[PDB]
UniProtKB/Swiss-Prot annotation, chain A:
Residue pairs linked by disulfide bridges in the UniProt entry: none
The UniProt record lists the keyword Ribosomal protein: yes
Protein name in the entry: Small ribosomal subunit protein bS18B
One Gene Ontology term of the molecular function aspect: structural constituent of ribosome
Swiss-Prot/TrEMBL keywords: Ribonucleoprotein, Ribosomal protein, RNA-binding, rRNA-binding
Gene name in the database record: rpsR2
An example Gene Ontology CC term for this record: cytosolic small ribosomal subunit
Family statement drawn from the similarity comment of this UniProt entry: Belongs to the bacterial ribosomal protein bS18 family.
Complex formation: Part of the 30S ribosomal subunit. Forms a tight heterodimer with protein bS6.
Position of the signal peptide: none
From Swiss-Prot, chain B:
Signal peptide: none
Family matches, as PANTHER family: RIBOSOMAL PROTEIN S15, BACTERIAL AND ORGANELLAR (PTHR23321), SMALL RIBOSOMAL SUBUNIT PROTEIN US15M (PTHR23321:SF26)
The protein's assembly and partners: Part of the 30S ribosomal subunit. Forms a bridge to the 50S subunit in the 70S ribosome, contacting the 23S rRNA.
Keyword entries, A-Z: Ribonucleoprotein, Ribosomal protein, RNA-binding, rRNA-binding
SUPFAM superfamilies: S15/NS1 RNA-binding domain
NCBIfam families: S15_bact (TIGR00952)
UniProt source species: Mycolicibacterium smegmatis (strain ATCC 700084 / mc(2)155) (Mycobacterium smegmatis)
Entries under Pfam families matching the protein: Ribosomal_S15
GO cellular component: cytosolic small ribosomal subunit
MF terms in GO: rRNA binding; structural constituent of ribosome
Protein name: Small ribosomal subunit protein uS15
Family: Belongs to the universal ribosomal protein uS15 family.
CDD domains, A to Z: Ribosomal_S15p_S13e
Swiss-Prot record, chain D:
Keyword annotations from UniProtKB, A to Z: Ribonucleoprotein, Ribosomal protein, RNA-binding, rRNA-binding
Full protein name: Large ribosomal subunit protein uL2
PANTHER family on file: LARGE RIBOSOMAL SUBUNIT PROTEIN UL2M (PTHR13691:SF5), RIBOSOMAL PROTEIN L2 (PTHR13691)
Any Gene Ontology biological process: cytoplasmic translation
Amino acid composition bias (Basic residues), ranges on this chain: 36-57, 268-275
UniProt cross-references to Gene3D superfamilies, sorted A to Z: 2.30.30.30, Nucleic acid-binding proteins, Ribosomal protein L2, domain 3
Swiss-Prot record, chain F:
Subunit structure, interactors included: Part of the 30S ribosomal subunit. Interacts with proteins S7 and S18. Binds to IF-3.
One GO biological process term: translation
Protein name as catalogued: Small ribosomal subunit protein uS11
Chain's gene name: rpsK
Shown part of the complete sequence: 23 to 137 of 138
GO cellular component, one term: ribonucleoprotein complex
GO molecular function: rRNA binding; structural constituent of ribosome
Chain spans, region Disordered: 97-115
RNA sequence: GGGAGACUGGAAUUCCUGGUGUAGCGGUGGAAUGCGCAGAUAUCAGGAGGAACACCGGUGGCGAAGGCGGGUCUCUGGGCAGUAACUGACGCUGAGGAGCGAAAGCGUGGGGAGCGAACAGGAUUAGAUACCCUGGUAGUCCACGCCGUAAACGGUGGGUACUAGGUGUGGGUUUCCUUCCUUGGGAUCCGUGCCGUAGCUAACGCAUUAAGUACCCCGCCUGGGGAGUACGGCCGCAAGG
């Protein structure tokens, strides 16, 4: 299918501060993209979702623009 | 649960030799410390039933270990009971 | 299992509960 | 808390007493005690102007510092928490660092040994007193002034608190314990926290004797009087008063606040009933 | 006569209704675009 | 007044459609409703009634000096696209389309299902 | 003595040159408590995704701190009391 | 998403205030009660409050079961893998007994936006103590306690060993293709599904997660109604169990 870019040897750590790394993972509506269309493992999907929520809380990402 | 430091000092106090971790005395001492910590935790959170179930499990395990010690040698059982301040 | 048995049991239970409701004060005063 | 009496006598069946757990001393401070005598509900003419008063235990007045405005920047330590017969709340005895002792109504959660500061530079811990301008919006306050210098008037009963809604201009909007929303000048000072002894309302007094100790005389219903005494009086057998309910002086029920008061402009919305 | 009623109370349960639900014989067919959804 | 640029808010529910041409600052200058053009009851949930209401509102804004509008569509789809087309067909240039439908993040309790 | 990361948003009105000293006085509670350490970083004047307390602009700050759980709560409580702080957030940079 | 506590965020509903703004809005299979012309619905700004946490999010995870997903912090329970350092049978089951136990309900004190038993109208109907519509109180929410029941179900008690495979998926260790990026592939341990042998079953089906082959301990059944009812007892504030 697709590639879990976070399990790789160059898998960048997931943060709620790096906004672009998360912007690549939310749809144009600001919703969190599903795991299948993304392809990452369940642990990394949970990390992505938690980071997105944290970033929304500190007004780094829109709450569904 | 307990961190490594309390585990080591308790084991040094109650371990039969300087290596054993699975002797009934060591297991009972560790269980006693864990039970006291859990009791003080549950004094504040009275509605943490899930942790209370784990407390019950620990109490049962300690009871079984003390039963084994008493059936093996009553002198060790009396010594441990008086050293740890337990009733029965 | 057929729901017929459940229906018979439920009609019995419903009738008994109705009877209990109809004689609450009488039972309380006799006991 | 609340201690419940066992039904040993018919007068103690459902009764309960306050559990004086926060009290740390059974005597008042001698230098802060003033004499108090009962009036019997009678004014300067010797006439009963308030019914159902008289009798009751002797009590002495403790001077309460409702005007905490001179000890700005001077810290105090909570020395004791005491019982006050003149109010539902308890009082805390403060030891100021300069050597002065005072009384304040004890806020909720205050403990012996705490540190109480006051002024614009104080923290927002319970018991601290600062002008409303320096108190952030949304906090819970008590013992609020009405004019800048008149002393605390609002939110003084046990368990009662005021919620500070927001400040605009020179006015801060507050939500009274009654639910009424009011505006007050920001220069008015207030104390942070709720008032303690919040469970005192749940006390079952048990017998008429306790109310007589508290200084309440029995109340006679107007329907069992004669028409010369009460508008509801008269009639053979029991009756409902034979008319719309009225006061003993004939005034009918309804709003009694005087219209066009000067304070009508300072009130956002009055309290509500039946909602 | 009970089975014959045919007034509104008799046929309110049979009305296909069920918006996008309970496919019935007279249920409204779904409108379909010319192009594939993708 | 003379507002050359404006906003059109279309609310299409399951039994009505409300059009209100609005000054970009949020002030309403001309509104038309599905029942305002002579329909009533179940008749006003039809796309044709939405078309009539949209055209009526478009005219009532056009004599007010409104030439260019942006549309904020909203509500379950009943006559939304017909309303947009009738807005364009009545001499109004429709620039941008935005679907602003209030989407709760799982908040209040919905009413019970009908049977 | 656990490592924390504390992100604060300060209102945009105040001068950016006074942010660095003003924070340092705020972190005096963690410094004096139990021999703790900070690494204060500033990247301010960034527009918010949504309006916060009638503000669209904001000055972001990131503080990396290693203190006692009681200490950091005390620092957090003071920060929210201050009116120059719009919002704040405390993370544990441990495995949590 | 195991549990408890504290603090906190945004969307939306409701209401209040103020603009713009007019004559309808709302609701249905179709309508009428209802709301509005005293300025409603719509639209914009501001404010208060409560409850639930969209996307992630599934036949995926955790928990003994009931059950558990907005965020952060504090405190805390269990599980799995590897090493195998330690004790050396300390195991299993468990009558009675104790604890936990959805929802509804009960008590005391708060709170109450939405939803909403009861209750009011409207409609349908031969009749509507209903279905549908408009309102709407308890309740739903919080704290502290009672209750102790469910289609509390996998309608399958717990422990252990053995008996063809094939294929998904969750957690962890490791050899070999080796770019070593790659679900590369294999091996192994622990879960969780689907299909399928032998075997079992009245049949349906189950089938290495057994309803197969066996051993230990517990619970329960003995035709259908009467009846999980009467009498007695115990428990409970009561409902009732």
């Amino acid at each position: 299918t697709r590639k879990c870019v976070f399990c790789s040897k160059k898998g960048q750590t997931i943060d709620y501060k790096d906004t672009a790394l998360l912007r690549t993972y939310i749809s144009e509506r600001g919703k969190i993209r599903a795991r299948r269309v993304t392809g990452n493992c369940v642990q990394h999907q949970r990390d992505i979702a938690v980071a997105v929520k944290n970033a929304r809380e500190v007004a780094l990402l829109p709450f569904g623009s | 649960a307990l961190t490594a430091e309390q585990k080591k000092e308790i084991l040094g106090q109650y371990g039969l030799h300087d290596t054993d971790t699975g002797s009934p005395e060591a297991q009972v001492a560790l269980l006693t410390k864990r039970i006291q910590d859990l009791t003080e935790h549950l004094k504040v959170h009275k509605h943490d039933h899930h942790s209370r179930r784990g407390l019950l499990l620990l109490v049962g395990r300690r009871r079984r270990l003390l039963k084994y010690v008493a059936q093996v040698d009553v002198a060790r059982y009396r010594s441990l009971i008086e050293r740890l301040g337990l009733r029965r | 299992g057929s729901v017929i048995k459940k229906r018979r049991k439920r009609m019995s239970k419903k009738k008994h509960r109705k009877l209990l409701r109809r004689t609450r004060v009488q039972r309380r005063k006799l006991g | 808390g609340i201690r419940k009496y066992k039904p040993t006598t018919p007068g103690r069946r459902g009764a309960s007493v306050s559990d004086f757990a926060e009290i740390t001393r059974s005597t008042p401070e001698k230098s802060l005690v003033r004499p108090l005598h009962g009036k019997g509900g009678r004014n300067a003419h010797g006439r009963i102007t308030t019914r159902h008063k008289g009798g009751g235990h002797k009590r002495a007045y403790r001077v309460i510092d409702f005007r905490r405005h001179d000890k700005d920047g001077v810290n105090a330590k909570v020395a004791h928490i005491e019982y006050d017969p003149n109010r539902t709340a308890n009082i805390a005895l403060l030891h100021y660092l300069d050597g002065e002792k005072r009384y304040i109504i004890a806020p909720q959660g205050l403990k012996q040994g705490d540190v109480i500061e006051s002024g614009a530079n104080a923290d927002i811990k319970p018991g601290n007193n600062l002008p409303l301008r320096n108190i952030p919006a949304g906090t819970v306050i008590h013992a609020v002034e009405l004019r800048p210098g008149g002393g605390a008037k609002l939110a003084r009963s046990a368990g009662v608190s005021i919620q500070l809604l927001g400040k605009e201009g020179t006015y801060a909007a507050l939500r009274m314990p009654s639910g009424e929303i009011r505006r007050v000048d920001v220069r008015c000072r207030a104390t942070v926290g709720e008032v303690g002894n919040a469970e005192q309302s749940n006390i079952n007094w048990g017998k008429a004797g306790r109310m007589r100790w508290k200084g309440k005389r029995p109340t006679v219903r107007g329907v069992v009087m004669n028409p010369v005494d009460h508008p509801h009086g008269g009639g053979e057998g029991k009756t409902s008063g034979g008319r719309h309910p009225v006061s003993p002086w004939g005034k009918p029920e309804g709003r009694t606040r005087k219209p066009n008061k000067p304070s009508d402009k300072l009130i956002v919305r009055r309290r509500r009933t039946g909602k | 006569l009970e089975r014959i009623a045919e007034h509104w109370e008799a046929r309110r349960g049979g009305v296909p209704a069920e918006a996008g639900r309970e496919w019935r014989h007279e249920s409204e067919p779904a409108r379909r675009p010319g192009y594939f959804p993708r | 007044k003379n507002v050359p640029h404006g906003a059109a808010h279309i609310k299409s529910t399951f039994n009505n459609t409300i059009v209100s041409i609005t000054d970009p600052q949020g002030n309403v200058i001309a509104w038309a409703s599905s029942g305002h053009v002579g329909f009533k009851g179940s008749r006003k949930s039809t796309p044709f009634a939405a078309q009539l209401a949209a055209e009526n509102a478009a005219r009532k804004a056009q004599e007010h000096g409104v030439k260019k509008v942006d549309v904020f569509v909203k509500g379950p789809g009943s006559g939304r696209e017909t309303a947009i087309r009738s807005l364009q067909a009545a001499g109004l240039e429709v620039g941008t389309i935005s679907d602003v439908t209030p989407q709760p993040h799982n908040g209040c309790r919905p009413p019970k299902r009908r049977r | 003595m656990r490592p924390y990361e504390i992100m604060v948003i300060l209102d945009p009105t105040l001068d950016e040159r006074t942010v660095a000293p003003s924070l340092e006085t705020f972190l005096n509670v963690i410094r004096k408590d139990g021999g703790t350490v900070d690494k204060v970083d500033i990247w301010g004047r960034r527009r918010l995704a949504y309006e916060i307390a009638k503000h669209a602009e904001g000055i972001y700050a990131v503080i990396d701190v290693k203190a006692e759980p009681a200490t950091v709560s005390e620092l957090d409580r003071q920060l929210n009391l201050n009116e120059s702080v719009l919002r704040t957030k405390v993370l544990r940079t441990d495995k949590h």
